[model samples]
Target: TLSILVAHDLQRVIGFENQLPWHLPNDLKHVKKLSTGHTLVMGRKTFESIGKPLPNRRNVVLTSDTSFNVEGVDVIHSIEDIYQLPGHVFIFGGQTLFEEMIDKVDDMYITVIEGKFRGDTFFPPYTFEDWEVASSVEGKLDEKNTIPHTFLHLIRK
Candidate 1:
């Protein structure tokens, strides 16, 4: 099975200059909780943005460049081959890859942040009608950062 894990603001802003624009330790905790021991997948830029492979997880990277190499990570040459991988695949993205694999995602764990942000990247449009919200939780506004967000768990219909 394949799933998507992402956080975006009200304007669908997912990132600014290849990084998250918000400051929320709570959300960071949630990221670690969900991604740990999972098969994490991302575009090359996203992997580069993070700077290193996350520990305790199977890292899979999508890059068109056949020459791109990173030790300890599974650098895949094409998107078509990702479907053959075993177990759950969590797509932790860079926008374009998310859009490319959106239809294949079986679930989505999304953090809906409550502020407008300045971003050069965005989450792509999908049919919300296809997914049902299975659960949601309100995250307290960080006193220091003043950011509020709701975590949503959606299952494909």
Candidate 2:
């Protein structure tokens, strides 16, 4: 099944430049747990921002560049090629990827940070009117986490 994995502020700001605007260790770990056995799908910029292949899972990069190739990554030129992938696929995005795939995703893994943050890139605008929260958990404030956030699993209603 296809899904999205993203963290954004209340204003839907996902990134400042090419990196996260806030530091939330638990949020990182949350995605790591879910993505461990599954494949991660991302756009070129997202893959570049990560710098290298994330171990233990297949890294799939959606790019228009036919010459795009990496030692450990699988490059896909077309969005329709997504159907050929195996098992659960998590789309870890840059803005364009999110916008293009939003309507097609079967589920969404959303982390909503409580406060507003300034950013250049944002998650695509969506009301999620047809989606329901299947599960949710509040993130606790701790040594590494200074922000309030909620992790939500949303599925089509």
Candidate 3:
């Protein structure tokens, strides 16, 4: 299934300095379980920020620089290239890539977090006008209760 797995704050903030602004164990574990054996369709910076390809998953980094390459990772130079990618594709993000895939997404596995912090990036602005929450659940917060969040699974209607 073509889907998006993301964690954004109330303000839709997603990244700060190329990295996630906050941490939530359950959210991380949830995504790890979903993406572990699948292929991630992501932007170059998003893949690089993780340092290495995520274990057990194929990484497809989208970038305009044709010369850019990484060991054990696939590079797609344009949006058209994504159409040629194989296997179950999940859209990960660095803003631009997310926006690009926004219209093509079949479902969205979203972690709607509770807190808001200063961030350099936000999830692409989108309306759920043609989408619906297929499922949702409250998440267990951390020991400090500072990371309370909800999981929303949205599918195009």
Candidate 4:
């Protein structure tokens, strides 16, 4: 199954004006587990956001611009290239990439934070008719500053 996994706020925002707060551990681990032995695809900006390749997974960076390059990471210039990947694939995102692939995704692993916040990036609004919630876990904030969050595993209906 093709999955689109992300952590977002009440506004459905995924990133702030220029970055994402480093507070969603459960969401990250969810992606890591779901992506094990599978392909993780993202846009060039999303790949650059990590500053380096993610270990123990295959990286497929989608880019229209030809200037970016990362060693050991496969680069594809179009959405069609995603189909060439073997087995299940995960589309990790940075706004544009997610919007482009959302309709094609079979599942979504989403972490919804309780509070609302200002942000420039947002996930497209989807409805129950289009997808169904398959599983979820509500997380309490740790001793650290992270807020209470919920993990939702959804499948397209």
Candidate 5:
């Protein structure tokens, strides 16, 4: 299935200076569990921020830059190519990628942080009007993960 796996704050902020504005270890673990062994589709800027490809997941980059190349990562130029990728494809993002894929995805795994944050990049203001919550889990506050958050699994209606 084509899905989006993302975490954003109350103001819908997902990034700051090309990196996450807050740290949540539990959220990281949750993302890893859901994304492991699946295909991760992200834009070139998102890929660059991570520096190297994440292990155990197929990294697919959508970039118009013809010269962009990396070891063990598949680089494609168009949005249509994403539909052709096999297995459970997860759209990891950098604004534009998420914006383009939002309507086309079958589901979304979203982590909603409780507070507003300082971010230059924001998640598209999509209200999930066409989706239903399949499941949801409220996270507890801990030393490593101070922020209150919730994990929501949303399926298209």
Candidate 6:
């Protein structure tokens, strides 16, 4: 099954700049646990944002250009490459990659921050007709920070 991980605003998902300004450590840990021993897929920009390979997971970077390359990172030219992977695969995104695989995703782990902010990158709208919430958690940042966020796990219907 394919699991997608993203965060977004209520109206528009991403910004024109292609970056997420907020930090979601809990959500990041959740993704790392879920994708352990599985393949993690992302676009070139998403891969670059992290600056290094995510340890203990197969990294699949999707790129259309023939010249794109990274050490120890498997480059995939098409979306169908995800099916051929041995274990579960997670699609991390920038706008283009998420939009491409949105309809085909099986599960989604999303963190919805309670407040709106100026952002360049975003998660796509979750359609009720296509998916159902499997689980959720609401949490405050910590004693120091007060940002509230809700984590939702969605399964495709």
**Residue 69, model 6, lDDT:** 77
Candidate 2: tens digits of C-alpha lDDT, residues 1-157? 8999999999999999899999999998998899988999899999999989898898999999998999999999989988899999998898889999999999999999999999999998777688898999999998889999999999976
Q: What do the candidate models score in CA lDDT, each in turn?
A: 0.88, 0.92, 0.86, 0.83, 0.93, 0.77
Query: Which one is best on lDDT?
Result: 5
lDDT of 6: 0.77
Give candidate 3's total backbone clashes. 0
**On a 0 to 1 TM-score scale, where does candidate 5 land against the true structure?**
0.97
Q: After superposition, how far is residue 80 of candidate 2 from its true place, in Å?
A: 0.6
lDDT of 5 by residue, 100-139 (tens): 9898999999999999999999888776688899999999
Q: What's the C-alpha lDDT at position 10 in model 6?
A: 56
Off-target runs (Cα >4 Å) in candidate 5 are none
lDDT ranking, best first: 5, 2, 1, 3, 4, 6
- Every model's TM-score: 0.94, 0.97, 0.93, 0.91, 0.97, 0.87
Report backbone clashes per prediction.
Answer: 0, 0, 0, 0, 0, 5
> If the candidates were sorted by their TM-score against the true structure, best first, what order would they fall in?
5, 2, 1, 3, 4, 6
lDDT of 2: 0.92
Residues 1-157 of candidate 3 have per-residue lDDT tens digits of 7898899999999999989999777887888998998989899889888988888998889988989888989888988888777777889897888888889978898889988878998887767788898989999766844588999999998
The collision pairs in model 3 are none
Per-residue lDDT for 1-157 in model 4, tens only? 7888788888898887557854666666767888878888988877777878888889999988787777879899989999888888888898998899888988998888777877888889988788888988887667754777888888988
**Where does candidate 1 have its weakest 10-residue lDDT segment?**
139-148
Error of 4 at 155 (Å): 1.1
Residues 83-145, candidate 6: write the lDDT tens digits: 887778888787778988888888987767677778766676667788898998885577544
Higher-scoring candidate on lDDT, 1 or 4 = 1
